[PDB]
Structure 1
Amino acid sequence: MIVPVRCFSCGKVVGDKWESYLNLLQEDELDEGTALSRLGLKRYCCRRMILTHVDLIEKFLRYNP
């Protein structure tokens, strides 16, 4: 639904990285590999967490109530 707090495999805090990663993509106009390295996500376990996250919360929020 939203950014998981920690990387499943090692527990790095990752839930604080999502807004910046969006920003790195759109306004610094960077690619995803470089984006994630700039966020210090070296271990590919951590990379997977943000790279494959799907932010469905953004759709749920469009419901009326």
Structure 2
Amino acid sequence: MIIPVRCFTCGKVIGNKWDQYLDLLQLDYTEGDALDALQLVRYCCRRMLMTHVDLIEKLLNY
């Protein structure tokens, strides 16, 4: 479904930094460089933003 609000291991809130992630992915930035602009230094809170399916845009049609 949607992006989770907190990280599953660390506990850092990441539910709000999803629209500004797709807004920076619309440009010519790399997926490894679009996370450094959101102040994420560990690879625990980066695999949530890097690998997440957006199923609600497929579930909102009906």
The TM-score with structure 2 as length reference comes to 0.93
Q: 1:12 — aligned with what?
A: 12
Q: How many residues align?
A: 62
Q: Say which SS state the counterpart of residue 44 (structure 1) adopts.
A: coil
1:25 aligns with 2:25: yes
Instruction: Provide the residue aligned with 1:52 in structure 2.
Output: 51
Please state how far the C-alpha of 1:7 moved relative to its aligned partner: 0.8
- In 2, Cα distance between equivalents of 1:34 and 1:53: 17
Alignment RMSD (CA, Å): 0.8
Q: Runs of 5+ in structure 1 lacking a partner?
A: none
Q: Please give the alpha-carbon distance, in whole angstroms, between the structure 1 residues aligned to 2:45 and 2:10.
A: 8
1:21-48 residue CA offsets vs partner (Å, 9 max, x unmatched): 101110x321111101111111101000
